[PDB]
Amino acid sequence: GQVIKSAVRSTVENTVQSTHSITTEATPALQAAETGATSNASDESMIETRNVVNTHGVAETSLEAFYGRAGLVAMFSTDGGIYRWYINFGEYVQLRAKLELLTYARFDMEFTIVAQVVNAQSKVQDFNVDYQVMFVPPGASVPENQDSYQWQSSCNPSVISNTGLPPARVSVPFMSSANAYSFSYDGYTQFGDTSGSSYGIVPSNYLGMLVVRTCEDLDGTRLRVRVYAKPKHVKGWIPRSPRMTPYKSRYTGVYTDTTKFCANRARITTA
Amino acid sequence: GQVIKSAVRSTVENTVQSTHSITTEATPALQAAETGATSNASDESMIETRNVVNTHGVAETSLEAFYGRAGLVAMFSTDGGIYRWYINFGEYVQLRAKLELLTYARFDMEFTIVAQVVNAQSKVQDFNVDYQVMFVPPGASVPENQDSYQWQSSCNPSVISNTGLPPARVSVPFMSSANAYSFSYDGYTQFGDTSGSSYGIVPSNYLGMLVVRTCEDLDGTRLRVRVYAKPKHVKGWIPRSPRMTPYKSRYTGVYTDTTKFCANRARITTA
Amino acid sequence: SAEACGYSDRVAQLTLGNSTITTQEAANIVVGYGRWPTSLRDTDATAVDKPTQPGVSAERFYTLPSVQWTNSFKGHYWKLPDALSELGLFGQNLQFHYLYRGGWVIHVQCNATKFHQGTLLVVATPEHKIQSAESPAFARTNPGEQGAAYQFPFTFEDGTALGNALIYPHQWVNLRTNNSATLVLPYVNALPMDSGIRHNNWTLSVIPIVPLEYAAGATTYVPITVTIAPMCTEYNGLRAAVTQ
Amino acid sequence: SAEACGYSDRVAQLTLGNSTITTQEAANIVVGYGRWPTSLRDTDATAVDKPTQPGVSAERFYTLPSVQWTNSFKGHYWKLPDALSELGLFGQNLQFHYLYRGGWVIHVQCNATKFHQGTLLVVATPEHKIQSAESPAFARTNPGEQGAAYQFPFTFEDGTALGNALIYPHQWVNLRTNNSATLVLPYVNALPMDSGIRHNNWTLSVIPIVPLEYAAGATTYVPITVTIAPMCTEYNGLRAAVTQ
Amino acid sequence: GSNIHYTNINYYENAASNSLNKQDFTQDPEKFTRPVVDVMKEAAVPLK
Amino acid sequence: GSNIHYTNINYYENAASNSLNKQDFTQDPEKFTRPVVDVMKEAAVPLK
Amino acid sequence: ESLVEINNVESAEGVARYRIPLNVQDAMDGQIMALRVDPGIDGPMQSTLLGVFTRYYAQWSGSLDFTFMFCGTFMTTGKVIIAYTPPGGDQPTNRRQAMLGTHVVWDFGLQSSITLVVPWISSGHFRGTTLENTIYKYRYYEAGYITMWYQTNMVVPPNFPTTASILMFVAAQPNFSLRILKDRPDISQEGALQ
Amino acid sequence: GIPTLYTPGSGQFLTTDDFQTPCMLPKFQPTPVIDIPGEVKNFLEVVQVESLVEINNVESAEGVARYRIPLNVQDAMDGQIMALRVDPGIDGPMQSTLLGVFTRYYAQWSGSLDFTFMFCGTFMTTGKVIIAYTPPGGDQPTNRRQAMLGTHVVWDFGLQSSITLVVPWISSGHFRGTTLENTIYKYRYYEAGYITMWYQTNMVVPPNFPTTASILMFVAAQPNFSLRILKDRPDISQEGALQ
Ligand SMILES: CCCCCCCCCCCCCCCCCC(=O)O
Ligand SMILES: CCCCCCCCCCCCCCCCCC(=O)O
Ligand SMILES: N[C@@H](CCC(=O)N[C@@H](CS)C(=O)NCC(=O)O)C(=O)O
Ligand SMILES: N[C@@H](CCC(=O)N[C@@H](CS)C(=O)NCC(=O)O)C(=O)O
Ligand SMILES: [Cl-]
Ligand SMILES: [Cl-]
Ligand SMILES: [Cl-]
Ligand SMILES: [Cl-]
Ligand SMILES: [K+]
Ligand SMILES: [K+]
Ligand SMILES: [K+]
Ligand SMILES: [K+]
Ligand SMILES: [K+]
Ligand SMILES: [K+]
Ligand SMILES: [K+]
Ligand SMILES: [K+]
């Protein structure tokens, strides 16, 4: 079972007045990092302190406050009036790096879609057009064209809006077949295959794809789309060592080796 | 009367721990499919099981959850500023196949209309225009032109909106003269006629038509319209064998004979 | 008394099954995330078959081949349960079942003398990916009982900072202070159970952060030994033996 | 009701672990010496280490290779635990431990038709020695999962009368009556536990006493199949795997 | 999953205007799976 | 800071539709900072 | 329960595809059939009731009921073993290997049918309904195999049919459920219907 | 229809907004929450865990060697061993630490800091060093005498291999900016001071022993530490879409 409790606080710890200490008994400053434990020396034991009723809160560092805001996860333009986006958050590094701070996490999500019409030279147009975003779960048929039958969307969820209306937005629940999404997986995607391409990816994190189209054909122009995602009701487990190297691939955590993280200085004795 | 009860559950069945069994009395594994009854052997009787408090829900497979979403039922373009659509769900296969999973069903419906203006080459236009959708019950006069008197719509329900506004939407109650809609009818549409063309269609399922027009004449362009329908408050009876062949006709279930449903494999002994 | 004065005694004895491990220079014992290994709850379980719980036949200490702390030593790591997948009955139960769940007791050993200096970080990392290569080699993702040598210690083989590996359960073997590290690890996963031949829940790393040095003429051959014991294990989905 | 009128129903189901055996032409079930398998009592035990009790991983039905009831068939036999010494986790636990103790559930199968006639004696003999030869061959004393063919059925391979083998737990498979025999056997030995690789406590024999005959033209290929399940097993003295 | 603090107030006259039903239970499938006159216990043989 | 007069009423069926959680506390970090078996008091020496 | 289109081979057309071929053997321990147990993938299960609805969803969970009915003459006897092999490797190659998994030994007699319950044994609470690999790597969810072997042999009297059939049924158990509705891949059209 | 008046802000997409919205799968029922060790509710739990400071960030030090503070037998007294600005969010040795990373995800911080040091020489190697914290106002102390006038601890190498110097929160305001960027914001205003280490006596060793040894430096937030105003971590960037 759990031998270490986790009592909750809503403010940081206060400082209590302390006095001098000349003894052979209590030695707060002496530590032993070898144990694997972080020092337990308090301010009051290292110096003489005053009373400080500290009312500073801890809200902005809660998982909900840290993750509870939208970030870009997809950005693309239609081709032939259609685009197929496989749902995954490895394309854009900012949100990706945030999620990788936890090993496992459960959360609902709010997706927001911002779309505009652009021409061949990628210049934005003031043109209102209806667009459809359809969620195609794995196993369902993905439309090949802008007018394929799958767009009937009688079972697949779809959202139809217009570039002239406010951004489209819908919430999605925690959908994994697992009991938490995994942001680090030391294993393979299947039995009987040990090729590197199938390592480090947990399939249950892939819930399908979003296919987008304009309901009718645009003449010479395309639909530009940005998809934002915002985690909600976050529950997380096992904090991880933060990413310290640039991302190189969308599906793997491969990186370029380095001999330093921070820049060098002239000498260790000059701050 | 009813000799078999139907108690309701909100979660699937739990698994209870079981032990070994060596007897001549209880023989759960032995069955007789000839009776017409599905096996009643439980997991606990076939193998030694552990306790599993299963909290998996059953909500997503309820009739309401299965049918409760919009699907395309009509799609057309005006001609001469008008279009007459006979209300029936056989044109687009996705929703059609879903409904045919039940023999009889009662439900209200939410209709959603999405319309845009397109030119002769079928290219979408950013043009806001007022359009009118009028429900003409059987027996009422159907307008011949975009400006006929029937559009006065003093009795027929009509909905007037604009391609610049959000999709139009209205609910309709369970309107059949019958006590349930029928998705399979082994009979004829009338007495004294046994021609094939009048077989397999129950007239009470046809509540009329939707006639559409632009309130004023478009210059060289047309109105493109999509109609979606979403069943609500569903009550169903007698599950049916699912469609297993492509649909060929809008009004009949005629099909092309086949000698197999799934694709072949090399041999029955290799999975 | 050790618990009376509020300190941790430097001696320790670990007894599991028919095996006993002792050390006279320990530095307390770490219990990962403050949690001891526990059995799967009926409300968390999903697989319905009655599980197999081998007990002492699998929950005991297995000692792996030793590793030499060479001059060029960058570190060494082992994947769990991979490293024991072919040792004793733990290995057999792992091979014969689709599903496995269990905790661990890890004991890393490295003694030198009061004339040597050096420091090893002993860390147990959950879901530790070896992703320094575009296409990771199976020999490095699943090195077996021999374990594998580190090639990129500074970046922890996964693109993070070695110095931040302390966020995971760990201890240090600082030659002037102790000669062993002990870690108790609970089962961690996003699932109640998983396949022991397709997924490694933990990775044990032993990394030299302060190079081994010593008074001129002292013993230069200093081995590092790892002894691991599965704890509170259970298996489901019995069939013929299958290895990765 | 079967127990009400005082008779034995001809159908039966045997469920152990993840295995279930059914028969619709049984002839009751025999419980050797009226005793079901039982665990070793603290007052009978001598080995002091905590035992391993594998449970469902080893206590389940294992089906061995079938044997053909040929025209010249004299009978076939299997030694226990020898026959399963290399099957599943039962075999693994047997190999990894010095000591073993356990019972059995044996199910012999042989179906023909109402147009065939023949009778097989299915007997489980404690300490059955194959001593027809001056120096018994290991291949015959420990035939493994394939079992061995009888060469001297009349003398039961041990110098006694076949007809008196009925003093041991047994049943008959008389084609006109039943197509299977089932025997539950408790552990029997002069010791609380013993080595599973040096001693076979029971020997299962299937001997034709009335030759297989049938209406001209009927199926001539009639197999005999043996399915055996270890029951209430425990092991002591863990070490590396060792086979005889 | 579903909320325990849902506000259900109908703004329209006809029930057809109401939102989707929120029950979603399942029932014993016996009328479809075992529509027989004579009960056949799981422990006994089906026909005798 | 935060309000003491906040109105929390859910308009939708599924909890996934709900607004962000409003707790935001922190807990004793011991399971991460001091995950050791033997308690080591701040006033005494760690190892003895 | 509904019939599995189990004999899906070139030589079998229409109704014959529901029959598992059984015949008098002249060798022992032979195999009769094999099948992946996954209810939503392309194959023998796709046209069953269970398969159709499973194909309307993205995830599933629960034990499965596989029932078999012998259809030979009253005089035809035999014993077969039906086994479920949890995932990890390939389908079992011989009876000895198959026999190590979950199984039932079936004896032909008055009660014409037998049920093999494929218990829910999975790492996660749910499994994806497709095993599509190229894009999603869903082969990760493979649920295992079901195989059938001769336990003894099919035996018949003189001049009797030396071949017989077994019908295979499948259904969901009471602990079965589905999640995430999706369009059934089998229903499609190339143009409006008239 | 209830009379309403829509206001400014209508239709806008504020990334930090918090409204209720229709669910794509209204009747979906998620998998149960199971018992998983290590649940974290607030990242303050993480920054309180000690991590190594990349303190020896000089040209000659590559990789792992950058975590080691060089110590050697002296032939002069009162010499300096190392120096560092204590600010947790600025570029430098602290930026790659746990504390540094999270501090870099925020614009303001407050609280005492824990700097722990572990000596890694041989059991026979002795020594005493003084570690001092110099509150702001001037430049880093030039000699031990000057440094010694501030907050400090005298560390004696022995059985207990480590020592902790608490850099108490001593600031004019309740919070400090996490960057000291000057050119634009003049944030040098928030400099928190320096931490320096000096030989109190000397590192002494027996015959033929290594005359050089190392000290590892750890840092973590104290229980009165907090962060405000989330911002994107400057270290995470990309020049094009990833494939
Ligand atoms: C119909 C409206 C469309 C709106 C979008 C719905 C998207 C549904 C998919 C949600 C799945 C989120 C899973 C997040 C985890 C992915 C992590 C990873 O990339 O590894
Ligand atoms: C005035 C606004 C117009 C909105 C549309 C109203 C439509 C009213 C008709 C509803 C009838 C629905 C019956 C569904 C059954 C048809 C089944 C079939 O095709 O066989
Ligand atoms: N391919 C069609 C034209 C496209 C079309 O009408 N597609 C229909 C039936 S295949 C559809 O399902 N459309 C969905 C939509 O566009 O909303 C043709 O035969 O000309
Ligand atoms: N046909 C008319 C022109 C059309 C017109 O005015 N139609 C009238 C009376 S017939 C009407 O009912 N219009 C309905 C509408 O357009 O809303 C004429 O005589 O020129
Ligand atoms: Cl598939
Ligand atoms: Cl497949
Ligand atoms: Cl800066
Ligand atoms: Cl600066
Ligand atoms: K306080
Ligand atoms: K202390
Ligand atoms: K601290
Ligand atoms: K339940
Ligand atoms: K039965
Ligand atoms: K059933
Ligand atoms: K046990
Ligand atoms: K047990």
Can you walk through the features of this model?
This is part of a larger assembly, with 2 copies of chain A (271 residues), 2 copies of chain C (244 residues), 2 copies of chain E (48 residues) and 2 copies of chain G. Chain C is mainly beta and 244 residues long. Chain C has a single domain (1-244), classed as Jelly Rolls (Sandwich). Chain C is built from 3 helices and 13 strands. In chain C, the strands form 3 sheets. In chain C, strands 3, 4, 5, 7, 11 and 13 form a 6-stranded mixed sheet that branches. The radius of gyration of chain C is 18 Å and the shape is globular. Chain C starts with a helix and ends in a 6-residue tail after the last strand. Chain E has one domain. Chain E is 8% helix and 4% strand. Chain E contains 1 helix and 1 strand, in the order βα. Chain E has one helix spanning 30-33; one strand spanning 26-27. Chain G has one domain (1-194): Jelly Rolls, CATH 2.60.120.20. Chain G contains 2 helices and 12 strands; from the N terminus they run E-E-E-H-E-E-E-H-E-E-E-E-E-E. The radius of gyration of chain G is 18 Å and the shape is globular. Chain B binds chain E through residues 2-10, 25-28, 30-32, 34-38, 40-42, 45, 57-62, 64-65, 68, 108, 171-174, 232-234, 239, and chain E through 1-2, 14-21, 23-28, 30-37, 40, 42-47. One glutathione sits between chains A (147, 149, 151-152) and B (72, 75, 92, 226).
Task: List the SSEs and their pairings.
The structure is cut from a larger assembly and holds two copies of chain A (271 residues), two copies of chain C (244 residues), two copies of chain E (48 residues) and two copies of chain G.
Chain A: E1 8-9, E2 30-31, H1 43-46, H2 63-67, E3 71-77, E4 82-86, H3 93-99, E5 102-118, E6 124-125, E7 130-136, E8 158-162, E9 168-172, E10 181-182, E11 209-214, E12 222-239
Antiparallel strand pairs in A: 3-12, 4-11, 5-6, 5-9, 5-10, 5-12, 7-8, 7-11
Chain C: H1 2-5, E1 12-16, E2 19-23, E3 30-31, E4 62-63, E5 67-68, E6 76-80, H2 88-96, E7 97-109, E8 116-126, H3 138-141, E9 148-149, E10 170-174, E11 180-185, E12 202-214, E13 223-238
Chain G: E1 2-3, E2 19-23, E3 31-36, H1 49-54, E4 57-61, E5 64-70, E6 79-85, H2 95-98, E7 102-107, E8 113-118, E9 127-128, E10 145-150, E11 163-172, E12 177-181
Antiparallel strand pairs in G: 1-11, 2-11, 3-10, 4-9, 4-12, 5-8, 5-11, 6-7, 6-10
The structure holds stearic acid (2 copies), glutathione (2 copies), chloride ion (4 copies) and potassium ion (8 copies).
Protein name (chains A, B): Genome polyprotein
Organism (chains A, B): Enterovirus F
Family (chains A, B): Belongs to the picornaviruses polyprotein family.
